[PDB]
Amino acid sequence: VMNRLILAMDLMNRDDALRVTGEVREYIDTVKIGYPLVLSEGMDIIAEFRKRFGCRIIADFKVANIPETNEKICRATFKAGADAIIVHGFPGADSVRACLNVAEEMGREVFLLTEMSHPGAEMFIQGAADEIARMGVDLGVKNYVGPSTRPERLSRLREIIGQDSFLISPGVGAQGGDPGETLRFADAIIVGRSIYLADNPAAAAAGIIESI
Amino acid sequence: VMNRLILAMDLMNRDDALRVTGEVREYIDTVKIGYPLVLSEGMDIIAEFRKRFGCRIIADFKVANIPETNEKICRATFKAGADAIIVHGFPGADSVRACLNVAEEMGREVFLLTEMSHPGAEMFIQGAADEIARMGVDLGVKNYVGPSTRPERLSRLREIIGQDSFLISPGVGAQGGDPGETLRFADAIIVGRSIYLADNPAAAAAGIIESI
Ligand SMILES: O=c1cnn([C@@H]2O[C@H](COP(=O)(O)O)[C@@H](O)[C@H]2O)c(=O)[nH]1
Ligand SMILES: O=c1cnn([C@@H]2O[C@H](COP(=O)(O)O)[C@@H](O)[C@H]2O)c(=O)[nH]1
Ligand SMILES: [Cl-]
Ligand SMILES: [Cl-]
């Protein structure tokens, strides 16, 4: 939310992750935490970040299992304090609905990943992306993830989900995406390495914000 | 959190509540919602505020029932999207523990109210307040509520809970409490009428912030 910039905190060491996140906190109030950090330091890192930085946490768990397993993963994730969870849409509607049901029970949110940003996404995901986005609309999904690396696809996704849906977008910086162009369609950009591997993370974040 | 100022949104009409909260959002990112608004507009107002303003929501429900009923109230409140719930400590440890158990299950927080700010608090609550605070410490409570109207009591409460516990304090402005003096002991101040009944809520909030 703050500055339309979400930090992707993929460092795998608690000390380095806490250092960088603290250094850029004045520029970002929303942190995306994924498996590189959680599998290395434990799920308790989510509540620690939430408390220490007063930031919202999106768990990038790319949930992609059968309904029953998806339900268990979402429950454990929200118990850990996550505000939202990112879920793949490719496994189908029943799998997404399972996540939505738990989010409803726990007062949390689901973000539906429709198209990925890397080269390999063109093989199978891109061809199903429009239909995955329409499925999200039909299921009542209001939060989506789309690719910074393909603004024409981000535009098409925005067209399907409408202006009221919230859209966040990774692939900015390291993967080649541009902050400003991405924000023509997405509500917020996700940035990882361009900030956390920088010699001065705060200066990198400030620079991105200034560019937009 | 933002500016150490929490808005107590006790207007009873959705339109007025949304107007004032939006007007002061640049100064406050945390809103306390209680029964005056919830009983008038419904529990869905919590998720609406959270989404529309991107603010944290503390549900001031003064939970004060037997354990079994407290569990049900906390579950419904967190399902509605609240980030935290304020609970009375006077009904005893089992009643507080029930709230803590649900907060743990749902990845949320409990704030323990130890002493109230109004005149009547001197009759029964004040005499039990130190023991209620010690009970909170023994139960692992890390968030507390104490009175702006009695800074000497707020100091005593801070002494019992320690410097690492988070303490918020209502009674600022309308009830007579002072922002700066209260912040000598509390981490954040709660302000309702001084802001929401002001001719210019944003100017009132800005003034409080400037005074501290
Ligand atoms: O299609 C997607 C979905 N998610 N992410 C994630 O967003 C972050 C982007 O990081 P980066 O800025 O370092 O490339 C990483 O956590 C990555 O797993 C992508 O990069 N692409
Ligand atoms: O001891 C307490 C506990 N809670 N509150 C609550 O905090 C808010 C303070 O509002 P005010 O600034 O308008 O007096 C109101 O919602 C009120 O119920 C108090 O005032 N005193
Ligand atoms: Cl990814
Ligand atoms: Cl009260």
Side-chain angles (χ1 to χ4, degrees):
Chain A
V1 186
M2 187 173 281
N3 293 118
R4 297 175 77 182
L5 179 60
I6 296 168
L7 172 67
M9 180 36 64
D10 300 312
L11 287 174
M12 303 177 74
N13 167 277
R14 175 172 167 280
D15 287 350
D16 296 336
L18 292 171
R19 177 196 89 243
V20 173
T21 305
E23 284 177 357
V24 304
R25 181 56 183 77
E26 80 190 74
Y27 304 108
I28 65 94
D29 71 338
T30 299
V31 182
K32 186 176 75 65
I33 294 181
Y35 286 134
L37 181 56
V38 160
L39 298 184
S40 295
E41 296 289 355
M43 288 287 276
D44 287 349
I45 197 75
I46 289 172
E48 178 169 29
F49 263 59
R50 210 160 172 290
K51 180 199 184 70
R52 183 165 173 159
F53 306 116
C55 58
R56 284 285 174 198
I57 298 300
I58 298 175
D60 188 4
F61 289 179
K62 302 292 204 309
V63 183
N65 309 263
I66 66 176
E68 291 87 348
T69 296
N70 277 8
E71 175 188 350
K72 290 175 175 183
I73 292 171
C74 291
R75 194 164 281 101
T77 302
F78 296 139
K79 172 170 180 182
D83 293 286
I85 194 167
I86 295 172
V87 180
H88 265 299
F90 214 67
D94 55 354
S95 287
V96 176
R97 182 175 298 110
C99 299
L100 291 171
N101 290 337
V102 177
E104 180 186 315
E105 176 180 358
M106 300 183 80
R108 310 303 182 65
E109 303 181 80
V110 165
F111 276 71
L112 182 65
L113 174 55
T114 61
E115 179 170 338
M116 290 176 78
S117 61
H118 67 299
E122 296 185 328
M123 291 187 58
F124 309 106
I125 296 170
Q126 179 172 271
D130 284 4
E131 190 177 350
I132 289 172
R134 288 186 186 293
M135 174 189 70
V137 172
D138 291 337
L139 293 175
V141 175
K142 297 299 193 77
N143 301 287
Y144 298 80
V145 187
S148 172
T149 52
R150 302 188 192 96
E152 84 286 18
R153 295 296 301 144
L154 205 56
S155 174
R156 173 55 180 153
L157 169 58
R158 169 58 76 186
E159 187 171 307
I160 293 167
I161 65 176
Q163 301 302 320
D164 304 322
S165 288
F166 186 66
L167 173 58
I168 65 181
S169 183
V172 178
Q175 296 179 58
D178 182 74
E181 286 294 295
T182 300
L183 290 174
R184 292 172 61 197
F185 309 107
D187 298 288
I189 50 172
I190 290 163
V191 178
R193 288 166 289 171
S194 288
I195 292 169
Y196 74 69
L197 295 181
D199 282 344
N200 186 332
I208 286 165
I209 294 170
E210 199 281 336
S211 75
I212 65 180
Chain B
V1 186
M2 187 173 281
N3 293 118
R4 297 175 77 182
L5 179 60
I6 296 168
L7 172 67
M9 180 36 64
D10 300 312
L11 287 174
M12 303 177 74
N13 167 277
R14 175 172 167 280
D15 287 350
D16 296 336
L18 292 171
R19 177 196 89 243
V20 173
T21 305
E23 284 177 357
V24 304
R25 181 56 183 77
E26 80 190 74
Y27 304 108
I28 65 94
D29 71 338
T30 299
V31 182
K32 186 176 75 65
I33 294 181
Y35 286 134
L37 181 56
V38 160
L39 298 184
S40 295
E41 296 289 355
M43 288 287 276
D44 287 349
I45 197 75
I46 289 172
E48 178 169 29
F49 263 59
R50 210 160 172 290
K51 180 199 184 70
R52 183 165 173 159
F53 306 116
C55 58
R56 284 285 174 198
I57 298 300
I58 298 175
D60 188 4
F61 289 179
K62 302 292 204 309
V63 183
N65 309 263
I66 66 176
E68 291 87 348
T69 296
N70 277 8
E71 175 188 350
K72 290 175 175 183
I73 292 171
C74 291
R75 194 164 281 101
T77 302
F78 296 139
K79 172 170 180 182
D83 293 286
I85 194 167
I86 295 172
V87 180
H88 265 299
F90 214 67
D94 55 354
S95 287
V96 176
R97 182 175 298 110
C99 299
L100 291 171
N101 290 337
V102 177
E104 180 186 315
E105 176 180 358
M106 300 183 80
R108 310 303 182 65
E109 303 181 80
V110 165
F111 276 71
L112 182 65
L113 174 55
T114 61
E115 179 170 338
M116 290 176 78
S117 61
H118 67 299
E122 296 185 328
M123 291 187 58
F124 309 106
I125 296 170
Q126 179 172 271
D130 284 4
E131 190 177 350
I132 289 172
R134 288 186 186 293
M135 174 189 70
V137 172
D138 291 337
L139 293 175
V141 175
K142 297 299 193 77
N143 301 287
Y144 298 80
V145 187
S148 172
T149 52
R150 302 188 192 96
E152 84 286 18
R153 295 296 301 144
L154 205 56
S155 174
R156 173 55 180 153
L157 169 58
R158 169 58 76 186
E159 187 171 307
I160 293 167
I161 65 176
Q163 301 302 320
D164 304 322
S165 288
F166 186 66
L167 173 58
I168 65 181
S169 183
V172 178
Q175 296 179 58
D178 182 74
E181 286 294 295
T182 300
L183 290 174
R184 292 172 61 197
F185 309 107
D187 298 288
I189 50 172
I190 290 163
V191 178
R193 288 166 289 171
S194 288
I195 292 169
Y196 74 69
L197 295 181
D199 282 344
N200 186 332
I208 286 165
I209 294 170
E210 199 281 336
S211 75
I212 65 180

